[PDB]
Symmetry: C3
Subunit: 223 residues, 3 copies
């Protein structure tokens, strides 16, 4: 009634009349009528874009927590990681002693980047092949909402709550994608992790805003 149908919520709010393409009829989750570039005029291209958006969104929602958790644990929990900041976490594998999980030498204790890379290649290749075509966990009936084995708690057994939860999922996913783009740009510009940036903004908001580093083009002092 508010996120589906003709009377739904739109991206420009009260100024959305005429900013909504005719092919965005509020049928799919997250339909705020924002296709100003006309990249989803074709229904098949629209479906491909929806799948890409939802997959990017779920990956970004995992990534926000994965980038905040080690740095937050180091700053406020006392855990001594090798590199808590997310953009330096990969370089842990080259450090002496390897990549210890939670800073504990008896956990994971990875030492070879090649083994990690190729194990991930194999596992993720199988996983994405199953995503596209089905596998051990079931058949890919829906490209985005397979359910069954991926809804063990049965939170989507009811169609209206299913639609509401799809709206919530796509909205939190778009927020997390926005936050991950923010993480990328903040790492490029400030050179410090998101937790450090947040702790600095709340300390002196006026003097520690984003325009302090505005003279750099994504970290490059060109001028």
């Amino acid at each position: 009634v508010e996120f589906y149908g003709p009377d739904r919520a739109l991206w420009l709010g009260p100024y959305s009349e005429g900013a909504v393409p005719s092919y965005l009829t509020g049928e799919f989750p997250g339909d705020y009528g924002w296709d100003s570039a006309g990249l989803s005029a074709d229904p098949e291209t629209f479906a491909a874009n929806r799948e890409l958006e939802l997959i990017h969104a779920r990956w970004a929602m995992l990534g926000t927590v994965g980038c905040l958790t080690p740095e937050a644990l180091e700053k406020y929990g006392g855990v001594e990681f090798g590199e808590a900041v997310w953009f330096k976490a990969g370089s842990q594998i080259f450090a002496e002693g390897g990549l210890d999980y939670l800073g504990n030498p008896s956990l994971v204790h990875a030492q070879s980047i090649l083994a990690i890379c190729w194990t991930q290649v194999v596992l993720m290749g199988l996983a994405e092949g199953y995503r596209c075509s089905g596998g051990p966990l079931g058949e890919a009936t829906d490209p985005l909402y397979p359910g069954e084995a991926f809804d063990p708690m049965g939170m989507a057994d009811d169609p209206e709550t299913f639609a509401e939860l799809k709206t919530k999922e796509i909205k939190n996913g778009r927020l997390a994608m926005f936050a991950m783009f923010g993480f990328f740009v903040q790492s490029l510009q400030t050179g410090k992790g998101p937790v450090e940036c947040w702790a600095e903004h709340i300390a002196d908001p006026v003097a520690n805003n984003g325009f302090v580093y505005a003279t750099k083009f994504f970290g490059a002092q060109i001028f």
Copy 2:
């Protein structure tokens, strides 16, 4: 007869027979039949691309004058700006004494970048909402040519002259967009403003061409 219809002017000149997509029938302004990438084969995507092109073009036409005027005034008019070149003009707000207009400390005299940014956010948000949906100045009857309040002098009251003026507008806009891409690349490469670059090419054209800085990839001396 020359910029509309089947006998119009095409992008490859005499070698255009067979390089013109069938959906570019010379109906809309600036139709030189250049869609080699097939990005406007969908009519709705074509309309979205036309709107994007015209808005980008009008912004670039404003930008050409906006980037040339302060630097030209400083170089040949004697006006003492804080930062005349366009790519350093933003940094004036961080300088001591703020951002004075025309170098006069009694004009504008901006001192806070947050105030500028958020005032612009509010004003431009309202302005673009009006562009999409209409507002105080009228109704968005046409996404690109609203007329009425935006044609006060009535220069588009004649359909033939209206089409000719639309062709002139789109051509000057494409030229301005090309020039602004040039401004961006020249700022990245040479590191000096467009007026300085122009004054240098006209001094020693052979020795001060664009290949002097060809060893830098958009300013970065990678190799």
Copy 3:
């Protein structure tokens, strides 16, 4: 039977059922059913994309040989080029003595970058105009397979062998495009030519892999 039709080869192999768009019916060469982004849903956009892919592929097939040949000749043949590595070959024109072909001062012996650039502009403009619309060498009956003057040996006179050779061409071209992207990224990251990189990987594969330079973002040590 294996690269055309319904029983052809697919991009995800055994996990391709449901990963193939309905509009990729295995009619055109190189149809592995990989359009996950839905950029070729429109048939006209599909044709434009096929033309772009084949042209990029032929250019990359030329480019791989053109980038490997001078460096390989310098390393294993003894030819003394001014700059054997492909990403520095352009800067030979600025060196003292100009650009000598094969290092011989009696071959080409180019001295002006402007003459090279503008001669190439004229010649390539005429050549691409002919490609689009036909010219001295024939008429552009097909955008990608004109034949006639461009098949002098008559290797495409049999439709079955013609289809097989089209598949071979598109596959070798896609491999060459992949390799040219590899050349770009390796030049950005390592800073040395592809032949040097290959000679280093085969010397100490474990210690001279691609993760040694993983801390740099396309050559920039941002962190």
